[PDB]
Ligand binder design. Sequence first.
Ligand SMILES: CNC(=O)[C@H](Cc1c[nH]c2ccccc12)NC(=O)c1ccc2cncc(-c3cc(OC(F)(F)F)ccc3OC)c2n1
Length: 375
Amino acid sequence: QGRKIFKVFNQDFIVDERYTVTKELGQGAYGIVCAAVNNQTSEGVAIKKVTNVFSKKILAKRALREIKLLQHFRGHRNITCLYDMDIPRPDNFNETYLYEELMECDLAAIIRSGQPLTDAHFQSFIYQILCGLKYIHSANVLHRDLKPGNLLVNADCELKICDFGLARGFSVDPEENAGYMTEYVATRWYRAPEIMLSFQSYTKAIDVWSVGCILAELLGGRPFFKGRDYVDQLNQILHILGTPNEETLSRIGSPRAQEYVRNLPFMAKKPFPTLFPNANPDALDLLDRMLAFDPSSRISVEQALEHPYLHIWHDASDEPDCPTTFNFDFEVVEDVGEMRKMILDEVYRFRQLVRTQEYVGQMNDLEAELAGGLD
Ligand SMILES: CNC(=O)[C@H](Cc1c[nH]c2ccccc12)NC(=O)c1ccc2cncc(-c3cc(OC(F)(F)F)ccc3OC)c2n1
């Protein structure tokens, strides 16, 4: 066997025998998560039981998407690192276990706690997000659902992005970009306006917008655009950013939406200094650029990393790109039996994988020559 069975969330939770489940962390539409310790090494881990994987084609597609994306993005300081995967009952398996780097809080909880945060905390959080996002984007992946809840934080206030279940491909080739699959809808409060407005310009700017909403939420201590539905969300965005210009207006590819926006009364932009009069002016300038209504005017991740607000943190030599782009060919598979086969392949291949000039060099070279000279 080699495994232990725990009872959590009123169901079986079957883990590697090296681990002891310590604590229930949460449950969502896709499974349940517990914290655990490696009893030998005392290392902590989050164990995620992805549940009912083959109950719906959509659940199996999401599981396979998360499994592959998590592997692609291991080894970044600001991204939750996948350590292991396991399928304890492979005969008729309807679940997969992912073993991920454990994190004590999330940014939504920290903001909820009301604990005091300094402008330096805000800078650190935004910087870390953008570093992780630069890595993800450099692989031509859009996270697509960034929000305080998926930004995990430990006691050192170190921050890591999690949850690739809704991520989406991106391509500069319009035909390819339009074919990338989007099974689930992202979180309304944080979703970029060009999406509900059918700009058809699905771009990396959609994530930058979410980062802006997060910065705004840090500055005010509460969600910035808190729409109860999409009409309400639109009205709240426009009430802050104001009537867009004719060019932006004409990019609204949805006729009811364009009609609605065009007929609204004039609305002046509400300047962010009036809304956050105690904030650092550099924070509000970067906020203004991240919450540009029109994606074409929105700051890019790399420009944001170079913004004066983050100049203390910015070290381009310390902001790596991902070595390769991620391949989304799998998402054309529509047969669940084949998705099962592919998930087994992913898990077994990953399991074997994880179980496998400078001054000194110049002087070592010179030393070897000086010893092996004459004679
Ligand atoms: C908002 N988005 C998510 O929270 C997804 C949800 C998700 C994506 N795929 C899944 C498959 C099965 C079950 C859940 C998921 N969490 C993760 O990606 C994930 C990654 C590394 C983690 C490392 N340490 C802790 C957690 C954690 C889990 C919790 O439990 C919950 F249930 F996740 F809330 C609650 C708080 C936590 O940290 C403070 C972690 N969480």
